[PDB]
Every structure is written in structure tokens, then in C-alpha cells.
Scaffold this active site. Structure first.
Site, short mmCIF file in Angstrom:
data_model
loop_
_atom_site.label_atom_id
_atom_site.label_comp_id
_atom_site.label_asym_id
_atom_site.label_seq_id
_atom_site.Cartn_x
_atom_site.Cartn_y
_atom_site.Cartn_z
N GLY A 1 0.86 -1.17 0.00
CA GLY A 1 0.00 0.00 0.00
C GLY A 1 0.89 1.22 0.00
N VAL B 1 9.87 -1.00 -9.21
CA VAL B 1 10.30 -0.73 -7.84
C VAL B 1 11.77 -0.32 -7.81
CG1 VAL B 1 10.72 -1.75 -5.59
CG2 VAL B 1 8.62 -2.31 -6.83
N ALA C 1 15.01 1.26 -5.13
CA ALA C 1 15.44 1.48 -3.76
C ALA C 1 15.26 2.94 -3.35
CB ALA C 1 16.90 1.10 -3.62
N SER D 1 15.91 5.55 0.27
CA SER D 1 16.49 5.59 1.60
C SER D 1 15.35 5.42 2.59
CB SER D 1 17.20 6.93 1.85
OG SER D 1 16.31 8.03 1.75
N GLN D 2 15.64 4.77 3.71
CA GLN D 2 14.63 4.53 4.74
C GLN D 2 15.22 4.79 6.12
OE1 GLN D 2 14.26 0.49 3.33
NE2 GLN D 2 12.08 0.76 2.88
N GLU E 1 4.61 -9.57 7.87
CA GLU E 1 5.15 -8.58 6.97
C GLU E 1 6.24 -9.30 6.20
OE1 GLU E 1 8.54 -6.59 9.95
OE2 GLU E 1 7.10 -5.34 8.85
#
Ligand SMILES: [Cl-]
Ligand SMILES: [Cl-]
Ligand code: NA
Ligand code: NA
Length: 599
Positions: free
Chosen positions: A434, A448, A450, A452-453, A546
Site C-alpha cells: 500500500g 520498484v 530502492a 532511503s529509509q 510482513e
């Protein structure tokens, strides 16, 4: 004396005397071709043999090649000042084929493609160079496809009387039955008869061209183009694009976030009226440009965004660009951040400053192989690994797009067809993702990528959930509006090649547990983060599952829309089970994941 007739004398074989200076030949094609009402590609080629290692060739001043036996340097373009430049390192000695593609038609690209084929003693195609793009602008392209001059001169030759042998010089034209998607991708090779089978072998997949080029017809216009038997080294098809004035990271980000050809950003003249280019493309390009100028390390993107949204009028130009489109800003800056980080970690000579202007190398990647690696000379470039995306698996039903009103032209019926097509192509469903509207556009169409997280590096990857109800919580913007309203997002279905399933592991250990990292590393057989593997486990003790796909695996997914809609009137609410189509549920069981490390 100085002139010669390339397509007459060198169609079979010619030996040109270069001892008295530059030799030239006019290359003229029927003007009716450059002025066609449809679309086509002129493919110019010739095989350069003896003497090809001490040469400077040129087509007008538009394209120049320098070959010294070690490299083949290419440069040119319509724009003055620093030209577009590339350098191909020879992987063999001997003859090589010079190729350039000039597009024709009214809505054609404004650049030409150039590529080299190294040949072995048996005249077999042994190595292919990246496909290079040189910006020409529409008028010069017309000139290159009508009347241009081929120039050849000896350069630092050790011969007393240098000569150049040329064979199979010629030009062909391919006419389509307007889409130029193949032109910017590895499929451009599918348009060239001489290259029949090369794409299938290197991409490890059929060309599967859309009707337009599927029904192409080709004709030799002059000379006698060569068609070499193959014996090519298993190297992925690659493209390389140089930005003379820099700004490559910004263009790459705009291309990936908006699903717009990369070369749109290197155009001599900006396209006008292009909605997606005006609303997403240029804004994203500008946003990345602004971030780089502020000399902010990409590792602070999250805080830079938080600060810009926290206080209006702050952060200067960058801060304002962010406030104008928060979610688009989050998507763009996090994608740019991830790519700059990869670039910097590529080699000792790469740094954050250089990532802003490095060439872009785009790879046509097989989905069943190991990781997709670029050529040896791509270490100093930004890299893009391209695999089939949701854009290829939408089926019939009209243009698909994401809106607060719902996904356009998307029904359960269309979804079932797309799901079957995905199974036919060897893909399998692994869960829901989502997200907000702009990210959905990027993911489904562009693929998709990459981003940054804000989490420990070991847990970096693409997050999905088998349960649509869990993914639903993320299918929205994450910030209210001036009217106290948060836009609803979209729920997407994530697929991966079945060949990727052996890399999917599961643990009953909440991925949030203290010993989680170690157990996952034990399962995947290597230190985190995830690579071409995934892990599924409770999001929290006693919670729903998850699944995290390592970025390399995430890039090879195919993501399409779910027929489960988001609710514009209840953003933030839980998924209403009654809104889940029963037929979608029937194609949403998840695969059997490995609970033990491979033996
Ligand atoms: Cl010259
Ligand atoms: Cl249904
Ligand atoms: Na030489
Ligand atoms: Na030039």
C-alpha cells in the site's frame, strides 16, 4: 580524389588510401524517408577492418569517433560547448562494426543511438558495446537522415601509407506498423533485423514487442549491411547516457519516479504541454537539483523534509519545493538518496558530489540470473537495473492511472486477466503493497526502486504484506492538508518470478525481536541486508505478517493494481473486508516459504 562513394565501393569491400589526407563520402537518402508520416529507424552500419586501430571518423561534425586500438571514443551532438562524450574499451582486437540509428517520424526522439560490435576472426559477433545516446535535435536528425558526409582520416598510424578497409557498408530502414518505448530500452535491438536473437539471448526473454514494431517491415536502402552470426559473450544489454552539463541524478530520479524516458531530460528542446512532464518530471528534476545545491548530505533527507514541512517559509528554495508536493518530494529525494549512496559505495573514486553528474548506465536484466552487474567501465556511473514491470502486465482495458477517485480502467475482470498473464510469464503473487498515488505510478510503471529509509541498514528493503488489510494502512499520504484532508492512496499486488521463490524465507520470530537479525542471517545464509532474498515474519509479537524483499529482488518484481479500492471518505480507517472482491481473494493465497536455510 579525396571523395569516394561509401555505399558503392564499400558495400562489399574497399581499401581506402589515407596517406594523402582525409577521405569523404556523401551519404544521401531519399528525402521522402526522413519526411515519412509514420515512424521508423534508419540503421547505418559498416565493418571496419585493417587500419581500424589508427582512425578518426566523423559524420559532419555531429558525430566523431576516434579508434586507437585500445578504445573507441565517441562524441558529438548539436549543442556547443562540451559535447556528449563516451569511451568504449575494446574487449578484442580485429574488426569491429560501427552502427548508428537515426529515428524518423513526426513524434520521434531527438537523439541518435550509437553502438559497436567487436567481431572475431570468423566474422562472428563477439562483443557488443553499450548503446550510446547523442542528442541532435530534430533538424540535425533530419540532416543525418537526408544528407551528411562521412569523413575518415588516419590518426597516429604506424603505417607508411595508411589504409582503412571497410566492408558491408550500408543503411537500412525499419518502418513500424506512436510508441518509442523500445528505443530507450534494450528492446531497441529487437527493431534491427541484423540483431535478431540477440535480445532473446541476453535478456533471456522474447522481445514480445507491441503491435507497432511487432509488424515492422525492413528494407535495405543502400549498400549491403552485414548480418553476423552470433557468438557473443553473455553480457547484459546496456545503455549509457552522458550529461555534458551534469544533472544526471536529477534526471534519473525524475525518470524513475515519474515513469518518463531518461532521454527526455537531455533533449535539445523541452517538450511542451506534456502533463506528466510538467507535473512530475520537471518538478522532481528541480527538487533533486535544489537538494544538491544546498550541499546537504543525502543521509539527512528525512530531517530536511520534516523541517521544510514543519515551518512554512523555511529551508529556502528547497524547502518551498518540498512543501509544494510533500509526497512527490519524499519519493524523489529518497530515491535519489539511495542511488547516491550506492554510487559512493561503488568505488574509492566515487563521492556524493560526483553522483550528481555521473553518466547513467541502464541495464536490461534477466530475472532468473543472479544479481545484475554492469560492465567493468560502469563503476563511475549511476546504475539502473531494468526488469519487466507492471506496465507490461495490465492487459486490455485502456490507460491505467492512480487517482483519489480510484484506479482508472481497473476492474476485477481486468485483474484476473493480468494475473493469468503473470502466471503465463512465470510470476507468482507474494503480497500487497500500500502506498501513496505518486509512488504507485512509479512502482507499477517504472518499476520498484530502492529508496532511503529511516531504519537500521540491515532491515533496508521493500516492505509488503500478504494481508491486504495490513498493507491498506499504508495506502495513503502521511500528512494532512490545508483543508484537513489526507489523500487516499492505492493498494498494489506484488509479484516475483517463481524462480525467486527459493530465496523467500520465513520465521515465527517477530522481526522486531532482539535475536531477529541473527536468525534471518542464518536463514538467508549471508549477512543482512537482504539481497536476492526475502523474509516474512510477524510485524510484532502476535501480529500479522510482513514481508521484506531485499532491494535487488524488489527491482525484479512486477507490481500491478489491486481491485481492492482505498476509501477517500475514510482515510486512516481500516480496510472494510466487504470491499475485497471474492475473486481477488481467490488469487491471493501466498507461497510456501522456507523455514530453514538452504542445505
Ligand atoms: Cl577529418
Ligand atoms: Cl469478485
Ligand atoms: Na593505434
Ligand atoms: Na562534434
Amino acid at each position: 580524389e579525396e571523395a569516394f562513394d561509401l555505399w558503392n565501393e564499400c558495400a562489399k569491400a574497399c581499401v581506402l588510401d589515407l596517406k594523402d589526407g582525409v577521405r569523404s563520402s556523401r551519404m544521401s537518402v531519399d528525402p521522402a524517408i526522413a519526411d515519412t508520416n509514420g515512424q521508423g529507424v534508419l540503421h547505418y552500419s559498416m565493418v571496419l577492418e585493417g587500419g581500424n586501430d589508427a582512425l578518426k571518423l566523423a559524420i559532419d561534425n555531429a558525430l566523431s569517433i576516434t579508434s586507437d586500438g585500445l578504445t573507441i571514443r565517441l562524441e558529438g551532438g548539436v549543442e556547443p560547448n562540451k559535447p556528449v562524450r563516451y569511451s568504449y574499451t575494446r574487449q578484442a582486437r580485429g574488426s569491429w562494426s560501427l552502427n548508428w540509428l537515426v529515428p524518423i517520424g513526426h513524434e520521434k526522439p531527438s537523439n541518435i543511438k550509437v553502438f559497436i560490435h567487436e567481431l572475431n576472426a570468423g566474422n562472428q559477433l563477439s562483443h557488443m558495446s553499450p548503446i550510446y545516446t547523442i542528442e541532435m535535435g530534430d533538424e540535425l536528425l533530419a540532416k543525418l537522415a537526408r544528407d551528411a558526409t562521412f569523413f575518415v582520416r588516419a590518426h597516429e598510424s604506424n603505417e607508411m601509407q595508411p589504409t582503412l578497409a571497410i566492408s558491408h557498408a550500408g543503411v537500412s530502414v525499419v518502418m513500424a506498423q506512436k510508441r518509442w518505448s523500445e528505443w530507450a530500452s534494450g528492446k531497441v535491438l529487437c527493431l534491427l533485423d541484423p540483431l535478431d536473437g540477440v535480445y532473446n539471448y541476453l535478456a533471456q526473454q522474447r522481445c514480445n514487442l507491441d503491435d507497432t514494431w511487432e509488424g515492422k517491415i525492413y528494407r535495405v536502402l543502400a549498400g549491403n549491411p552485414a548480418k553476423h552470426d552470433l557468438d557473443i559473450k553473455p553480457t547484459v544489454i546496456s545503455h549509457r547516457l552522458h550529461f555534458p552539463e551534469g544533472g544526471s541524478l536529477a534526471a534519473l530520479t525524475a525518470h524513475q519516479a515519474c515513469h518518463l524516458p531518461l532521454e527526455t531530460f537531455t533533449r535539445h528542446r523541452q517538450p511542451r504541454g506534456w502533463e506528466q512532464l510538467e507535473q512530475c518530471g520537471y518538478p522532481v528534476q528541480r527538487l533533486v537539483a535544489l537538494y544538491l545545491a544546498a550541499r546537504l548530505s543525502w543521509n539527512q533527507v528525512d530531517q530536511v523534509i520534516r523541517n521544510a514541512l514543519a515551518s512554512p517559509g523555511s529551508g529556502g528554495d528547497l524547502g518551498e519545493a518540498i512543501r509544494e508536493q510533500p509526497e512527490q518530494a519524499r519519493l524523489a529525494l529518497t530515491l535519489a538518496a539511495a542511488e547516491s549512496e550506492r554510487f559512493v559505495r561503488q568505488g574509492t573514486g566515487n563521492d556524493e558530489a560526483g553522483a550528481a553528474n555521473a553518466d547513467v548506465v541502464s541495464l536490461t536484466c534477466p530475472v532468473a540470473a543472479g544479481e545484475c552487474a554492469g560492465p567493468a567501465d560502469s563503476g563511475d556511473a549511476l546504475l539502473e537495473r531494468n526488469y519487466p514491470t507492471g506496465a507490461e502486465f495490465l492487459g486490455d482495458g485502456g490507460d491505467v492511472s492512480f487517482s483519489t477517485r480510484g484506479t482508472q480502467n481497473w476492474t476485477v475482470e481486468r485483474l484476473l486477466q493480468a494475473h493469468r498473464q503473470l502466471e503465463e510469464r512465470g510470476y507468482v503473487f507474494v503480497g500487497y503493497h500500500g502506498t501513496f498515488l505518486e509512488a504507485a505510478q512509479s512502482i507499477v510503471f517504472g518499476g520498484v526502486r530502492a529508496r532511503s529509509q529511516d531504519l537500521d541498514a540491515i532491515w533496508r528493503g521493500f516492505y509488503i504484506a500478504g494481508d491486504p488489510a495490513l498493507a491498506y494502512g499504508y495506502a495513503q499520504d502521511q500528512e494532512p492538508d490545508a483543508r484537513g484532508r489526507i489523500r487516499n492512496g492505492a493498494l498494489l499486488r506484488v509479484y516475483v518470478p517463481r524462480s525467486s521463490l527459493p530465496g523467500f524465507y520465513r520465521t515465527s520470530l517477530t522481526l522486531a525481536a532482539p535475536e531477529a537479525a541473527g536468525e534471518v542471517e542464518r536463514l538467508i545464509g549471508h549477512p543482512l541486508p537482504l539481497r536476492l532474498d526475502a523474509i516474512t515474519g510477524p510485524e510484532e509479537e502476535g501480529g500479522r505478517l510482513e514481508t521484506i524483499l531485499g532491494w535487488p529482488l524488489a527491482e525484479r518484481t512486477v507490481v500491478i493494481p489491486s481491485a481492492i479500492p482505498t476509501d477517500p471518505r475514510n482515510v486512516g480507517g481500516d480496510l472494510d473486508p466487504s470491499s475485497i472482491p471474492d475473486k481477488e481473494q481467490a488469487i491471493s493465497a501466498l507461497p510456501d516459504y522456507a523455514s530453514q536455510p538452504g542445505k
